[PDB]
Design a protein around this ligand. Structure first.
Ligand SMILES: Nc1ncnc2c1ncn2[C@@H]1O[C@H](COP(=O)(O)OP(=O)(O)OP(=O)(O)O)[C@@H](O)[C@H]1O
Ligand SMILES: Nc1ncnc2c1ncn2[C@@H]1O[C@H](COP(=O)(O)OP(=O)(O)OP(=O)(O)O)[C@@H](O)[C@H]1O
Ligand SMILES: [Zn+2]
Ligand SMILES: [Zn+2]
Lengths: 468, 210, 210
């Protein structure tokens, strides 16, 4: 099987950390005893020294390869990187062949200790431009209600975190949803039918749906104060209703891995939320879900509770056997061992954090999508920017009826403009594929003149001039 | 189901010694003001196993009408050191506002064994928490704690001091008239025959406990 | 409040042996120690408990103006393995930048006992780092480690090698001429006294440590 091009590059590099000679070393200069030996990239002591709170899963893959492959014979190639299962094997390899009549300890799911995950799949989410997500908050500034979107992007290496993958996003697509002041809830059938055609155009453009965003602002008084502070240390970090939508999105998009026995493991999916800081701004934060316990129990046992920090655990009806969930908390006198014989266990423990950021404006490798970021989006029907062909006379117009190719190609690289053109499918699919590849790639000057000489682009500007 | 005076037998002379020892601080505290000396707080029952010492503690609690609470032996040791001390503190707080009350604990040998033979860490953990809570409480709430074991010198000897556990009560085996009363309670639902004699089975089993 | 120059009676006839291993690396390294002899850095003070070493090490730091340190045996070694190593490593690099410096170590027997029946390996970890850090300080580091203990035979024989620990000085119990200065120090703070000399009282207190 074949993995991603980014995932195979992190596997080949060892990522060792070099050290220097010290006063504690008693050996010679041409050697190393223990104090200047090469440090492994999975040691968590070096991680918390530089305030890195997770061990960068590609290095966690290396720390399990040392346990799988040894100096001894072995002759196995097991590679035990699989999803730990809480479901019940029906055959059970014993005399209690039905679960209605019989269950023993080798098939019973053990009591969940609630230990936090030490490794994250995505180590650092990054963005492309501050003007891209400024249009997303501007949707709230016009209708006053919450929004929703899906992030399309790619992946590359990250040199800050040892053996880490960074998440790059390029554009944000919004599905048609019904907004509300308190929260939001849309139909999953019309979104999945709409997201199927966007994945078609994302393949030729080199994009993949790897993220989503949802807003939560609660403006205070619209004067000096920006927003309220809903999510803090004493309150919930992520609501339990949005854990369900984050869990189903990770199971729909698996990550291919040759080390896993099933063929897919350790999904690379980000969930970002606009919530605001403690003091005064609308700074965002992102956390992703845990694979070890939460990713498998969401198929059978997650039920909604009235508290945003916790989630209710329901009962067993003849196939849905669940084990007891335990966690430690302080009582009125001291700190005690596991107490939970009670439902509504918290879900903030099962989240691992990420580091969001925006790159510097002075230099970058590329940006690939900065045309205007002011074009009316596809499914923004709550706002007034959902126009017909009247907008195409205002937006591009083949500027001033005779456009220069340095000023014409800079507008054609928009994500939602190219996704609006092919829906009319005036051009051929072969000429459309070279149209979107010219706008997204470099050395575009020889191929842009091929587009203007084609009869399909001439019919597009002729059918636009007669219409309003 | 609740138990009373008729549901036990054999130790009727022994029960009357425990009767006047626990019903005087509960019902009539005016004798404490008249004589000016502290009535006892902790009694200790012991003897051979299977003599119904747990049944006698439920009989003296329901008939007096006090707030009864039970603390079993191995249920404290089934937890760890953290939550077992918190459960012991919660039992003594609810009995203070519900005065008069009886805090009956059971199986003190599992909690307090002989410490000097196995000088350990947990052998002085839960008993030192109990000793600062038993000797430390003072609110004149006239509550009585009852202990139960199978051997009087198997427990740690520091518990048998003044103010904590002073009155020792032995629970002996019933006599011929005593063991007759035990089977009459159990055979209330057993449809026996007419040829079964009542006094014949008492002389048959010489040293049988209830 | 600090110690004076001598301030301890009954040691001035042997205080030069501890002193002469200090100024001779620093006051004359050109004509006295440039022949090709490395300076010995490891001394070993011992004796009965109460002869006052802990101080004697304070007196040589005041008489020479050198930097002083304080490391107790069962205090630093009672921490973690990485915690005791970090306090050991940060003390020697601090002593390098303020030469001359004196690193006082007490109670060597608790860190390095004999290996005839003392099973287990938790003591040999920290004593291997002490012999490691005593090597790479050859050139100009004016440091003299002072090891304080009670019995010289209880220390491990591996510590007594070339360069690690060479001097074994033993301050002894003073006589009537020695303990008279000890009585002279602790009576000059008194307001008045009798008309009887202190040597008449110190004559019968022969086996009495200072
Ligand atoms: N009046 C009575 N005297 C003696 N035994 C009785 C009496 N009434 C009933 N019994 C019988 O004796 C048993 C009582 O024993 P019990 O349950 O107290 O065990 P125990 O070992 O004394 O309790 P613990 O485990 O607290 O020591 C009952 O099973 C009951 O059938
Ligand atoms: N010249 C002297 N000889 C003996 N004792 C003295 C002298 N001068 C002062 N003393 C007294 O003896 C004490 C010195 O004891 P010290 O502090 O050395 O205890 P120690 O047990 O020897 O130290 P350690 O804990 O390192 O073994 C001081 O408190 C001091 O009052
Ligand atoms: Zn080394
Ligand atoms: Zn089974």
């Amino acid at each position: 099987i074949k993995e991603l091009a980014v995932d195979e590059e992190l596997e080949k590099e060892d990522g060792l950390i070099p050290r220097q000679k010290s006063k504690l070393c008693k050996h010679g200069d041409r050697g190393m005893c223990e104090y200047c030996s090469p440090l492994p990239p999975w040691d968590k002591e070096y991680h918390e020294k530089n305030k890195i709170k997770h061990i960068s899963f590609h290095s966690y893959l290396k720390k399990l390869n040392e346990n799988a492959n040894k100096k001894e014979n072995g002759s196995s190639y097991i590679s035990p990187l699989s999803e730990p299962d809480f479901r019940i094997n029906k055959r059970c390899h014993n005399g209690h062949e039905p679960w209605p009549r019989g269950i023993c300890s080798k098939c019973q799911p053990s009591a969940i200790t609630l230990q936090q995950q030490e490794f994250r799949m995505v180590d650092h989410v990054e963005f492309q431009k501050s003007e891209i997500i400024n249009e997303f908050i501007q949707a709230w500034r016009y209708t006053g209600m919450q929004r929703f979107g899906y992030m399309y992007g790619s992946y590359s290496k990250y040199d800050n975190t040892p053996l880490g993958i960074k998440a790059v996003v390029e554009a944000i697509y919004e599905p048609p949803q019904h907004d509300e002041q308190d929260g939001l809830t849309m139909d999953v059938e019309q979104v999945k039918n709409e997201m199927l055609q966007i994945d078609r155009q994302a393949q030729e453009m080199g994009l993949s749906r790897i993220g989503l965003i949802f807003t939560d602002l609660s403006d205070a008084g619209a004067g000096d104060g920006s927003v309220f502070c809903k999510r803090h240390k004493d309150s919930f970090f992520l609501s339990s209703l949005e854990v369900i939508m984050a869990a189903r999105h990770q199971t729909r998009h698996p990550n291919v891995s040759k080390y896993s026995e099933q063929g897919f493991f350790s999904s690379k999916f980000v969930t970002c939320v606009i919530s605001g800081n403690l003091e005064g701004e609308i700074d965002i934060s992102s956390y992703q879900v845990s694979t070890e316990a939460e990713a498998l129990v969401t198929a059978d046992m997650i039920s909604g509770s009235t508290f945003p920090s916790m989630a209710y655990i329901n009962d067993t009806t003849d196939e849905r056997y669940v084990p007891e969930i335990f966690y430690m908390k302080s009582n009125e006198y001291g700190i005690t061992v596991k107490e939970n014989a009670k439902p509504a266990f918290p879900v903030d423990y099962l989240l691992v954090t990420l580091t969001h950021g925006f790159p510097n404006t002075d230099t970058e490798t590329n940006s690939k999508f900065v045309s205007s970021t002011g074009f009316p989006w596809s499914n923004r029907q709550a706002m007034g920017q959902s126009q017909d062909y009247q907008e195409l006379k205002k937006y591009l117009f083949n500027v001033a009826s005779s456009g220069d190719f340095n000023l014409l190609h800079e507008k054609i690289s928009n994500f939602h403009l190219l996704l609006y053109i092919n829906s009319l499918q005036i051009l051929s699919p072969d000429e459309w594929k070279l149209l979107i590849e010219s706008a997204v790639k470099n050395e575009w000057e020889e191929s842009l003149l091929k587009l203007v000489s084609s009869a399909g682009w001439q019919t597009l500007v002729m059918i636009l001039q007669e219409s309003g | 189901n609740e138990v009373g005076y008729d549901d036990i037998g054999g130790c009727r002379k022994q029960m009357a010694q425990i009767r006047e020892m626990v019903e005087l601080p509960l019902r009539h505290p005016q004798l404490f003001k008249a004589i000016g000396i502290k009535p006892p707080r902790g009694v200790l029952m012991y003897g051979p196993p299977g003599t119904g010492k747990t049944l006698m503690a439920r009989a003296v609690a329901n008939e007096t009408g006090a707030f009864f609470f039970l603390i079993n032996g191995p249920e404290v040791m089934s937890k760890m050191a953290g939550e077992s001390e918190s459960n012991l503190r919660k039992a003594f707080e609810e009995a203070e506002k519900n005065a008069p009350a009886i805090i009956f604990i059971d199986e003190i040998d599992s909690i307090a064994p002989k410490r000097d033979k196995t000088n350990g860490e947990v052998e002085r953990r839960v008993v030192s928490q109990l000793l600062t809570l038993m000797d430390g409480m003072k609110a004149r709430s006239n509550v009585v704690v009852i202990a139960a074991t199978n051997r009087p010198n198997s427990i740690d000897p520091a518990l048998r001091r003044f103010g904590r556990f002073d009155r020792e009560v032995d629970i002996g085996i019933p006599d011929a008239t005593g063991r007759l009363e035990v089977l009459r309670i159990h055979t209330k639902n057993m449809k026996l025959a007419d040829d079964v004699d009542l006094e014949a089975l008492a002389a048959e089993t010489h040293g049988y406990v209830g």
